[PDB]
């Protein structure tokens, strides 16, 4: 089979910038190289076929080039709706093969997270479980640190973090932090605190509740 290799698995650029994504084949593919876009929701469409032919209905800011084993996709000015993963694909010989994909992130102005904390629900408490949940929403850039404090004391165990995709409309990220405890472990403490440190501020954003 023909191995297809993309330049990077990820890159980041600003609105209005020109971006180029490269693709190399392990054997000559006679210009039979095609490019696809996969939106974060999973939807896939073809952009370019036969190296350089723009697919009808696809904006002309997309273009392609190359020959032999070396090919490129270029987006001449980056728009908001271009957040996606880009894939090349050789159609010269079976089995038809794809590159590993290049994820494209859009740069934007820094934004502080909005933080919300939530105690374990009653329904959950009765079932013998205790999950404390923290949402850190609509922040940029992606890098963020969350600490859990129980009665002033940091906890590491049973904390699970999950980030969203870059959101297609405003280019922010969100994340959830979930601290899972036993009910009787939850019941032995009072103050539960979620602290987020992000480049937008020297001071952590602190959110807190008392079990009373």
């Amino acid at each position: 089979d023909i191995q297809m290799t993309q330049s990077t698995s990820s890159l980041s650029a600003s609105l209005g910038d020109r971006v180029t994504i490269s693709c190399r084949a392990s054997q000559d593919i006679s210009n039979y190289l095609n490019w696809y876009q996969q939106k974060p929701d999973g939807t896939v469409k073809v952009l370019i076929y036969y190296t350089s032919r723009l697919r009808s209905g696809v904006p002309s800011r997309f273009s392609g080039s190359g020959s032999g084993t070396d090919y490129s996709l270029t987006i001449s000015n980056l728009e908001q709706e271009d957040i996606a993963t880009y894939f090349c694909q050789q159609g010269n010989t079976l089995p038809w093969t794809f590159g590993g994909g290049t994820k494209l992130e859009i740069k934007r102005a820094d934004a502080a997270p909005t933080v919300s904390i939530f105690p374990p629900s009653s329904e959950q408490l009765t079932s013998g479980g205790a999950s404390v949940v923290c949402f850190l929403n609509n922040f940029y850039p992606k890098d963020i640190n969350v600490k859990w404090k129980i009665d002033g004391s940091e906890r590491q165990n049973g904390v699970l973090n999950s980030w969203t995709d870059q959101d297609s409309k405003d280019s922010t990220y969100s994340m959830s932090s979930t601290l899972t405890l036993t009910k009787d472990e939850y019941e032995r403490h009072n103050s539960y605190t979620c602290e987020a440190t992000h480049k937008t501020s020297t001071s952590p954003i602190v959110k807190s509740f008392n079990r009373n």
């Binding site: 006679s30 210009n31 190289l33 076929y49 794809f98 949402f135 929403n137 969203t164």
Partner: protein, 224 residues
């Protein structure tokens, strides 16, 4: 507009068998080659199989890892494409897409490419058992500001495919779906929504959680 709708995906035991279908419209099905392409969770696209038109004797071809275990077929009278999958391995776990080949080589080149894609159907090959989710509301414990953020915690389900909607989808603008994580044996995720404070709790806000693999639907109203 070309449409491709796949079905039949679901949980199946290793060494099991499963049959995918795809329904097509918006083009002349019997003049095109058709394909299946797949994508393992967090991985890239992989071509699986191809079947040509009747004029080209319905010639089939397969990816190396699926040859001799998968069969691709078509029913032109119903505009349907199928994939019979046998002796399933854990590495067959993936989203499977029905895909229409490019048209006439004279105008589009001899090289293979994939003109139209379905949205896909999920196949999970695992010995684990179907388990419905527990759905816990996430309501403030707390001082009110100009907005308010509510959530639903969805815990303890398998396999991975739940949809969370808010007020039957009438609330869509500020919804965040956090990817599911394996606990392990079993998946967890939450979903959040932000509304103006005037909206809640005066008006009602309900999150609906569907888990097709277990035909479960739960609607949870958020208390204050």
């Amino acid at each position: 507009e070309v449409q491709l709708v796949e079905s039949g995906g679901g949980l199946v035991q290793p060494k099991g068998s499963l049959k995918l279908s795809c329904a097509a419209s918006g083009f002349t099905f019997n003049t095109y080659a058709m394909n299946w392409v797949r994508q393992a969770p967090g991985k890239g696209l992989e071509w699986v199989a191809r079947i040509r038109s009747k004029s080209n004797n319905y010639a089939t071809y397969y990816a190396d890892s699926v040859k001799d275990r998968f069969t691709i077929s078509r029913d032109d009278s119903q505009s349907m494409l199928y994939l019979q999958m046998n002796n399933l391995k854990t590495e067959d776990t993936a989203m499977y897409y029905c895909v229409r080949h490019r048209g006439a080589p004279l105008y589009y080149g001899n090289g293979a490419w994939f003109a139209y894609w379905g949205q896909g159907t999920l196949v999970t090959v695992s010995a684990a058992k179907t388990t419905p989710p527990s759905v816990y509301p996430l309501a403030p414990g707390d001082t009110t500001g100009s907005s308010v953020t509510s959530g639903c915690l969805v815990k303890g389900y398998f396999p991975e495919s739940v949809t969370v909607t808010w007020n039957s989808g009438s609330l869509s603008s500020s919804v965040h779906t956090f990817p599911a994580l394996l606990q392990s044996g079993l998946y967890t995720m939450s979903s959040s929504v932000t509304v103006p404070s005037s909206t809640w709790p005066s008006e009602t806000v309900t999150c609906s959680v569907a888990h097709p693999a277990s035909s479960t639907t739960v609607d949870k109203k958020l208390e204050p």
